[PDB]
């Protein structure tokens, strides 16, 4: 039940766990898509990050258009609680919690 992250045809990255290993493919259950595991290829996977953050930096942010997942972004401002970010290329105000340093882990 080793937890992972999977890139979706959406380009984004969605928490999950490895249920099973095969030759060409992994078999993963999802967050609130547990139920259909796809069976997945090597390179679409990577590990979650283990355990600074400030503006103009590049980050991943946690959203949807559909499940929720991680989308790449840039802090183009922050102020008080709130951060202005930029994702091709919409915009939004989020908060610390919606937010994280890019996971620069690597696919398998």
UniProtKB/Swiss-Prot annotation:
It is found in: Cytoplasm, Cytoplasmic ribonucleoprotein granule; Cytoplasm, Stress granule; Cytoplasm; Cell projection, Dendrite. Transmembrane segments: none annotated. Expressed in all tissues examined including heart, brain, kidney and testis. In brain, present at high level in neurons and especially in the Purkinje cells at the interface between the granular layer and the molecular layer (at protein level). Residues 2-48, 57-102 form the Agenet-like domain. Phosphorylated by MAPK1/ERK2, promoting subsequent phosphorylation by GSK3B. Phosphorylated by GSK3B, promoting ubiquitination and degradation by the proteasome. Ubiquitinated by the SCF(FBXO4) complex, leading to its degradation by the proteasome: ubiquitination by the SCF(FBXO4) complex takes place following phosphorylation by GSK3B. Ubiquitinated and degraded in a GSK3B-dependent manner in during both scaling and sleep deprivation. Ubiquitinated via 'Lys-63'-linked ubiquitin, leading to its degradation: interaction with CEP63 inhibits 'Lys-63'-linked ubiquitination. Induction: By Interleukin-19 (IL19). Disulfide bonds: none annotated. It is linked to Congenital myopathy 9A: An autosomal recessive muscular disorder characterized by severe hypotonia apparent at birth, poor feeding, ulnar deviation of the hands, laterally deviated feet, fractures of the long bones, respiratory insufficiency due to muscle weakness, and death in infancy. Congenital myopathy 9B, proximal, with minicore lesions: An autosomal recessive, slowly progressive muscular disorder characterized by primarily proximal muscle weakness, neonatal hypotonia leading to delayed motor development, mildly delayed walking in childhood, and difficulty running or climbing. Cardiac function is unaffected, but most patients have obstructive sleep apnea. Muscle biopsy shows type 1 fiber predominance with disorganized Z-lines and minicores that disrupt the myofibrillar striation pattern. Homodimer (via CC domains); homodiremization is required for FXR1-network nucleation. Interacts with FMR1. Interacts with FRX2. Interacts with TDRD3. Interacts with HABP4. Interacts with CYFIP2 but not with CYFIP1. Interacts with EIF4G3; promoting translation of target mRNAs. Interacts with ELAVL1. Interacts with CEP63; inhibiting 'Lys-63'-linked ubiquitination. Interacts with PKP3; the interaction facilitates the binding of PKP3 to PKP2 mRNA. Interacts with PKP1; the interaction may facilitate the binding of PKP1 to PKP2, PKP3 and DSP mRNA. (Microbial infection) Interacts with Sindbis virus non-structural protein 3 (via C-terminus); this interaction inhibits the formation of host stress granules on viral mRNAs and the nsp3-FXR1 complexes bind viral RNAs and probably orchestrate the assembly of viral replication complexes. mRNA-binding protein that acts as a regulator of mRNAs translation and/or stability, and which is required for various processes, such as neurogenesis, muscle development and spermatogenesis. Specifically binds to AU-rich elements (AREs) in the 3'-UTR of target mRNAs. Promotes formation of some phase-separated membraneless compartment by undergoing liquid-liquid phase separation upon binding to AREs-containing mRNAs, leading to assemble mRNAs into cytoplasmic ribonucleoprotein granules that concentrate mRNAs with associated regulatory factors. This is RNA-binding protein FXR1. The lineage of its organism: Eukaryota, Metazoa, Chordata, Craniata, Vertebrata.
């Amino acid at each position: 039940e080793l937890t992972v992250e999977v890139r979706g045809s959406n380009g984004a990255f969605y928490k999950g766990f490895i249920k099973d290993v095969h030759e060409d493919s992994l078999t993963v259950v999802f967050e609130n898509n547990w139920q259909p595991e796809r069976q997945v290829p090597f390179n679409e996977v990577r590990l979650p990050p283990p355990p600074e953050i400030s503006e103009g930096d590049e980050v991943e942010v946690y959203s949807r258009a559909e499940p929720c997942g991680w989308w790449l972004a840039k802090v183009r401002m922050m102020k008080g609680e709130f951060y202005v970010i930029e994702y091709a290329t919409y915009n939004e105000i989020v908060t610390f919690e919606r937010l994280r340093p890019v996971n620069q882990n690597k696919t398998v």
